[PDB]
Write a protein that binds this ligand. Structure first.
Ligand SMILES: CCCCCCCCCCCCCC(=O)SCCNC(=O)CCNC(=O)[C@@H](O)C(C)(C)COP(=O)(O)O
Ligand code: SF4
Ligand code: SF4
Ligand code: FES
Ligand SMILES: [Zn+2]
Lengths: 67, 89, 683, 205, 61, 115
């Protein structure tokens, strides 16, 4: 209560709520369901569990390592 | 927290002496749990009879461009787009 | 002789009668499309793209190999020419795989650009749905190449390059018709010091750089002109830099030096700038360990060791050092009262004053016009491979006959070995041997001497003997004396005034010693006294840096701007395409800062003032890309057998420290030894 | 027919050809070369000293009533001896047409202002003052119009870099918006999109 | 007027880039993997490459 | 060599020198109205010293068209300072009050960074 926002709607009901499709996901047999599809998450900004970026490539110049 | 010391699928992790782990005291590190390598070697290879086979991603127009793989060489032949493996007995 | 008139695109032009349609077209400016015509290879008619319509002819002619006659009107922009080009390359593109996003040649592929210009807009190939296009298996040609034979268009450039320039005939054309595959019949490795150029010569990119595997894209690449320093040819290259990282080394066309050709060691050593680098200044603390310190503390430690030396100071120049660091090192040693400097590769005594004793006096572009050459203990296939390409071109075209002195070597062409004794080196200079009569009867003779015989003392007299024979072989605008060096710093150091003896600094017995990019391993700690202080200035950690009491990190040849002088004497300057990593800086800046910390500063604070100081040294080092003709070169022969250091490919791969640091050369050596051990297991 | 290829207008080509020869006959001193480009547009390349009368002629002749001056465009070509070129685009409502009058200007050579003829140029040449840096003599008000008040240099000159030379931030020990040397967080990745094979054989002559 | 005209104070360039940068006039190198010479057909001015670095946040140049 | 060009507001060097001295006089009169109005932390004498330094770094030019272009640009800055037409952030840009100075000796430049 008093914490509702627009990010609580999952991916299957998002097109039904935004009038993209007239088919609810109860009878929408075309929507896939794979093993790697994660559950829906809200916007976690302003929270200790937010996103913060980083470099994905590792170090490309290696030093000596005298020993 | 184990997400700071977790390694991504590109082989990247910050060291314990690095100053760049100070950015993760207030926001958690995002590491994708679904590595593409494990989910592409979980798919078994497809046994085929013809000398050449065609791959299109398994979706038609929604997959990759259609390419032809030769199967006369023994072993597993990997499609360079989707990673599906073909084999001829 | 006379010039015949041909009307190309309704434009009259006077051409030599031996020229073809495409040469006259390139003379007036129009570029006729091609896939198999390379001007350094033999002509062929297999790609059929260059079809042009000449007047009063029933069929179009191939412009690459049809010689012109008087009165022809060639129409490049005709309707029949464009129809023929569109049909021919539609046939080229009916069986090409849809591999453009996973193809490393894409963005600079000839087939993509020749479809956007003089190509059709849509594919007429209905049969993609059923009984579709072909696919052929990949052949493990080598560890340097990545072969996807489905993308090959059968243009026969790689086979002509192997059988014409590379020398070995491992590549071939198997099969007949639509199932023809351009590859080796068995699982073999194609090995040449020139396989990287095959990636250059493949127009579609079926043959791909395997160290440059999916790394970047050609529109993204910042291209910077540089000169490779690992070989002594001084070949002009272009370096691919994107987002402050080296990607690959590609040839840049200089007709005098390299002519679109690059060695495998010069090309596939871009990984060596990434591994075993030096990023921090290191000082050997008295507990026995080399620890990384700050720049100012390392500089004052080297200054305190210099002040504790008190007159016994010597310095050794290496193989990767440029002209400017050698000038700064010699200026620092001469300002500190030390008259001894050293170079790693040795030389004869008294040959410093005249350039012709250490110069490839015949031009590398002129060596293709030689009629008979003599090799005195050198292997130019591995020591300086573009000189071997020039000798192969002169062997193919100018009917060159070549005799060699030393052990049995493969020069990628037919040659006769006279022997291994040095006394017959006198005999060719005496006139008793028949090859002396061959050299005297030749129109443009030459004698090529390796530098490792000039490292020897008594063979130095051999040098003088060859000079006497050059007084019997002098020709107008042709100097027969030739000395083929190994590293790119020896000629520059002898131009400055270095004593090229590496044992000279050991015999001087200094208290502090300067190693400037030296990794040859000629100096150890047991030769030096116990109070020595070895200072390393170079960029790569190796056996030169393993014996150093103070390690100062430098920049590589792609990270600094520096003049290098090759064997022929052409001084060329590299360009800083990528910033140095860590706390590494330019070497002459390290020497100037050391002069500031010690107390006697060098008079130059900028690079242009250092070029002015080089002008004060010698005016020919200031001008770049211009070679002045040197003068004439100016006796107990020892009984030692003549030996060559580079006799095989595995010795050629680990010549230099940058080539030592890279894992590509280790992969090549492992693949070569694996192929040899499988051959020995099968036999 | 050819549905992909654009069909031109023959009567507009004939009318602009006759009017271009008429303009080249009327002013032999200032008109340097009259050309008719593809797309049925007439370009009258003129001398710099004829910048003010020719437009006046094109304002005031009975077969040249180019009442509107829609814009003035400057093109920076550094390879030429006279660097900038200045393109006046004029619209005629009476004869329902357009003309382009092109002149060349050095970095220091003036241009006589067309504000006595067309008042819209009262700002338009100001833009050419700000973007390129050519002085317009007899201008009622010549100032920088689009750039910063403390800006140095001219932006759309090709010698000027894309990202400029300086940046602005906020500084608390001075309590002011301050000027700093330019450092991008990520540099502008230059793409090499030059064509290696020529496509148009009609433009090499 | 003399034809040798210095326009450094007019162009708005800072003086440090005037006294420090070196300008290379060159014909651009042909791509060795491509037979086309249309991009070779011009000369061009380019400026000397200074230091690039990695930003500590995310890893750009 | 020799070249015949159209002049900008002056024929010879003496008129351009007179225009530069007119700029110096007008900027001298405009400085005390700049100081009291713009809310800047610069004393009037520091402003006049900065004006002198701005003229000193352009004393070296000799060409009259370059001098007159500098006169035109200085007149534009004067017109942007008579009417206020600006803020205090742009007036202080001449002093470069935010840039920390860099050393000129080679040892400190070697220690700090490659620039
Ligand atoms: C409070 C804010 C202060 C703002 C200061 C900035 C004002 C703008 C500064 C300028 O206008 S820079 C351009 C000045 N123009 C010139 O210097 C023209 C060339 N100067 C000369 O030739 C000089 O030799 C003089 C100025 C003639 C001095 O020569 P004397 O010796 O015969
Ligand atoms: S060879 Fe050329 S056309 Fe074929 S897939 Fe590669 S980039 Fe595309
Ligand atoms: S592999 Fe490349 S170079 Fe060799 S024939 Fe095929 S397309 Fe030509
Ligand atoms: S270029 Fe003439 S047939 Fe290939
Ligand atoms: Zn696939």
């Amino acid at each position: 209560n008093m914490d509702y926002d627009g990010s609580m709607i999952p991916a299957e009901w998002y097109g039904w709520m935004h009038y993209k499709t007239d088919l609810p996901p109860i009878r929408d047999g075309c929507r896939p369901k794979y093993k790697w599809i994660a559950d829906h998450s809200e916007n976690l900004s302003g929270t200790k569990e937010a996103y913060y970026p980083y470099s994905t490539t590792p170090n490309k110049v290696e030093a000596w390592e005298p020993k | 927290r184990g997400d700071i010391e977790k390694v991504t699928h590109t082989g990247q992790v910050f060291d314990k002496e690095d100053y760049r782990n100070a950015r993760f005291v207030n926001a958690k590190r995002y590491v994708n749990e679904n590595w593409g390598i494990k989910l592409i070697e979980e798919v078994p290879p497809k046994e085929c009879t013809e000398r050449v086979v065609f791959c299109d991603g398994g979706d038609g127009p929604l997959g990759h461009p259609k390419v032809y793989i030769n199967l006369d060489k023994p072993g597993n032949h990997i499609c360079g787009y989707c990673g599906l493996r073909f084999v001829k007995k | 002789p006379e010039k015949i008139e041909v009307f190309v695109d309704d434009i009259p032009v006077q051409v030599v009668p031996g020229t073809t349609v495409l040469q006259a077209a390139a003379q007036i400016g129009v570029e006729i499309p091609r896939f198999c015509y390379h001007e350094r290879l033999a002509v062929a008619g297999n790609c059929r793209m260059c079809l042009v319509e000449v007047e009063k002819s029933p069929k179009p002619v191939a412009a690459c190999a049809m010689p012109v006659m008087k009165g022809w009107r060639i129409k490049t922009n005709s309707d029949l020419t464009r129809k023929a080009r569109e049909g021919v390359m539609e046939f080229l593109l009916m069986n090409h795989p849809l591999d453009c996003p996973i193809c490393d040649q894409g963005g600079e592929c000839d087939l993509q650009d020749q479809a956007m210009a003089f190509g059709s807009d849509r594919s007429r190939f209905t049969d993609i749905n059923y009984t579709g296009k072909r696919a052929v298996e990949d052949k493990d040609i080598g560890p340097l190449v990545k072969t996807i034979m489905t993308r090959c268009i059968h243009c026969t450039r790689c086979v002509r390059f192997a059988s014409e320039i590379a020398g070995v005939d491992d590549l071939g054309t198997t099969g007949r018709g639509n199932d023809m595959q351009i590859g080796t019949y068995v699982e073999k490795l194609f090995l040449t010091e020139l396989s990287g150029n095959v990636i250059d010569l493949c127009p579609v990119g079926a043959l791909t750089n395997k160290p440059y595997s999916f790394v970047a894209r050609p529109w993204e690449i910042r291209k910077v002109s540089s000169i490779d320093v690992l070989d002594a040819v001084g070949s002009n290259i272009v370096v691919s830099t994107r987002t402050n990282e080296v990607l690959r080394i590609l040839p840049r066309e200089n007709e005098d030096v390299n002519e679109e050709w690059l060695a495998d060691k010069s090309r596939f050593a871009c990984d060596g700038l990434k591994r075993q680098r030096l990023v921090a200044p290191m000082v050997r603390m008295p507990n026995g360990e080399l620890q990384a310190v700050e720049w100012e503390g390392a500089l004052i430690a080297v200054a305190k060791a210099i002040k504790a030396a008190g007159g016994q100071i010597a310095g050794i120049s290496g193989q990767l050092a440029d002209l400017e660091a050698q000038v700064a090192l010699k200026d620092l040693l001469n300002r500190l009262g030390s008259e001894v400097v050293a170079t790693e590769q040795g030389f004869i005594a008294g040959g410093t004053d005249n350039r012709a004793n250490y110069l490839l006096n015949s031009t590398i572009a002129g060596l293709e016009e030689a009629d008979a050459v003599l090799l005195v203990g050198t292997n130019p296939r591995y020591e300086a491979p573009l000189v071997n390409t020039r000798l192969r071109k002169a062997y193919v075209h100018n009917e060159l006959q070549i005799a060699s002195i030393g052990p049995k070597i493969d020069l990628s062409y037919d040659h006769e070995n006279l022997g291994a004794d040095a006394a017959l080196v006198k005999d060719v200079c005496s006139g008793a041997h028949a090859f002396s009569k061959v050299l005297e009867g030749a129109k443009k003779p030459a004698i090529i001497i390796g530098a490792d015989l000039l490292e020897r003392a008594d063979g130095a007299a051999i040098h003088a003997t060859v000079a006497e024979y050059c007084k019997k072989l002098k020709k107008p605008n042709w100097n027969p004396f030739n000395v083929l060096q190994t590293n790119a710093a020896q000629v520059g150091a002898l131009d400055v005034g270095y004593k090229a003896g590496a044992q000279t600094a050991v015999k001087a017995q200094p208290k502090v010693l300067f190693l400037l990019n030296a990794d040859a391993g000629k100096v150890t700690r047991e030769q030096l006294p116990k109070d020595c202080f070895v200072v390393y200035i170079g960029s790569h950690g190796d056996n030169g840096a393993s014996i150093a009491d103070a390690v100062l990190p430098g920049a590589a040849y792609t990270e600094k701007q520096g003049i290098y002088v090759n064997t022929e004497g052409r001084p060329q300057q590299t360009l800083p395409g990528v910033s140095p990593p860590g706390m590494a800086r330019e070497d002459w800046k390290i020497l100037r800062a050391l002069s500031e910390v010690v107390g006697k500063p060098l008079p130059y604070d900028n690079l242009d003032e250092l070029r002015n100081r080089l002008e004060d040294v010698a005016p020919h080092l200031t001008r770049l890309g211009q070679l002045e003709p040197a003068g004439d070169a100016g006796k107990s022969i020892g009984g030692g057998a003549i030996d060559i250091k580079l006799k095989e490919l595995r010795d050629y791969f680990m010549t230099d420290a940058i080539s030592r640091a890279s894992p590509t050369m280790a992969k090549c050596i492992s693949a070569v030894n694996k192929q040899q051990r499988e051959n020995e297991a099968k036999q | 027919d050819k549905p992909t290829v654009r069909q031109p207008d023959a009567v507009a080509r004939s009318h602009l050809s006759d009017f271009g020869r008429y303009v080249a006959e009327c002013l032999p001193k200032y008109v340097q070369k009259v050309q008719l480009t593809a797309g049925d547009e007439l370009e009258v390349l003129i001398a710099p000293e004829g910048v003010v009368p020719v437009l006046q002629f094109l304002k005031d002749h009975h077969q040249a009533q180019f009442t509107n001056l829609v814009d003035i465009a400057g093109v920076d070509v550094p390879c030429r001896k006279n660097r900038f070129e200045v393109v006046y685009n004029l619209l005629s409502l009476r004869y329902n047409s357009r003309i382009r009058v092109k002149t060349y200007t050095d970095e220091l050579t003036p241009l006589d202002s067309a504000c006595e003829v067309h008042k819209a140029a009262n700002w338009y040449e100001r833009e050419i003052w700000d973007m390129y840096g050519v002085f317009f003599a007899n201008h009622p008000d010549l100032r920088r119009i689009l750039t910063d008040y403390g800006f140095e240099g001219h932006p759309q000159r090709r010698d000027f870099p894309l990202s400029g030379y300086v940046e602005l931030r906020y500084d608390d020990e001075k309590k002011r918006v301050v000027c700093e040397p330019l450092e991008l967080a990520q540099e502008f990745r230059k793409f090499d999109l030059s064509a290696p094979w020529e496509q148009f054989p009609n433009f090499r002559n | 007027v003399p034809t040798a005209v210095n326009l450094s104070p007019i162009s708005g360039v800072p003086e440090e880039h005037i006294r420090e940068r070196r300008v290379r006039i060159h014909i651009p190198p042909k791509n060795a993997m491509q037979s086309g010479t249309d991009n070779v057909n011009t000369w061009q001015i380019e400026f000397d490459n200074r230091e690039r670095w990695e930003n500590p946040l995310m890893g750009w140049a | 060599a020799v070249q015949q060009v159209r002049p900008i507001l002056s024929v010879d060097r003496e008129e351009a020198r007179k225009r530069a001295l007119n700029l110096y006089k007008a900027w001298y009169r405009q400085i005390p109205y700049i100081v009291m109005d713009y809310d800047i932390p610069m004393t009037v004498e520091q402003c006049r010293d900065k004006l002198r330094e701005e003229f000193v770094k352009h004393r070296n030019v000799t060409d009259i068209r370059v001098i007159d272009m500098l006169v035109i640009k200085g007149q534009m800055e004067l017109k942007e300072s008579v009417e206020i037409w600006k803020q205090k952030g742009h007036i202080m840009r001449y002093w470069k009050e935010s840039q920390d100075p860099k050393p000129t000796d080679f040892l400190s430049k070697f220690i700090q960074g490659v620039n």
